[PDB]
């Protein structure tokens, strides 16, 4: 199990590598054997989509009293947590774990 | 059936399906003799009432009655927490009622 947290796999999702194909500038009219070092300045943009299906393990606890749950605080604040600021900057105000429900040992 | 055979089992559990939750609750009850098997006319005069706003007339019966018209009679605190944290609405659909293991002393 990865020490930083997560799922350890011998064959994880493969690395996806992307590069802009070089586009040479105008070459000299006389042959030169050296590799070209004059290229048209280029960059690329586009959209990327990733879809992941997750399997869930539902809880079947017989605990009587209510569990601890992650919840936002109703108390008034200048900004909504996990939202944008007045300058459009998105922020994550706190780390959120996964361990709120309980089960016996 | 017979004296030495139970007429029912203890059923108390909650079953959570996709769009439905089934709550079952079993309780032990005690029923005394009310009014010494008599019907009695009652009123604010019999109870000593004086105010016009609290005057009444009615009858007290030797019968008891079963009441389960409170949510905690069916939902445990954890089930209630699940219902309120995971659903936009709910409503009762059908009812099953049982009396068993009668013991007269």
UniProtKB/TrEMBL annotation, chain B:
Localization: Virion
Family: Belongs to the parvoviridae capsid protein family.
Protein name: Capsid protein VP1
Native organism: Adeno-associated virus 9 (AAV9)
Whole-protein coverage range: 219 to 323 of 736
């Amino acid at each position: 199990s990865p020490l930083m947290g997560g799922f350890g796999m011998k064959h994880p999702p493969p690395q996806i590598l992307i590069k802009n194909t070089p586009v040479p500038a105008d070459p000299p009219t006389a042959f030169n054997k050296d590799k070209l070092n004059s290229f048209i300045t280029q960059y690329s943009t586009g959209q990327v989509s990733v879809e992941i299906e997750w399997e869930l393990q539902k809880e079947n606890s017989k605990r009587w009293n209510p569990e601890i749950q992650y919840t936002s605080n109703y108390y008034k604040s200048n900004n909504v947590e996990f939202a944008v600021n007045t300058e459009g900057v998105y922020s994550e105000p706190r780390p959120i774990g996964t361990r709120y429900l309980t089960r016996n040992l | 059936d017979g004296v030495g055979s139970s007429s029912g089992n203890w059923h108390c559990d909650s079953q959570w399906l996709g769009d439905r939750v089934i709550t079952t609750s079993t309780r032990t009850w005690a029923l005394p003799t009310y009014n010494n098997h008599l019907y009695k006319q009652i009123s604010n005069s019999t109870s000593g009432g004086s105010s016009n706003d609290n005057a009444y007339f009615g009858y007290s019966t030797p019968w008891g009655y079963f009441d389960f018209n409170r949510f905690h009679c069916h939902f445990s605190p954890r089930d209630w927490q699940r219902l309120i944290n995971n659903n936009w609405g709910f409503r009762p659909k059908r009812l099953n009622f049982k009396l068993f293991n009668i013991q007269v002393k």
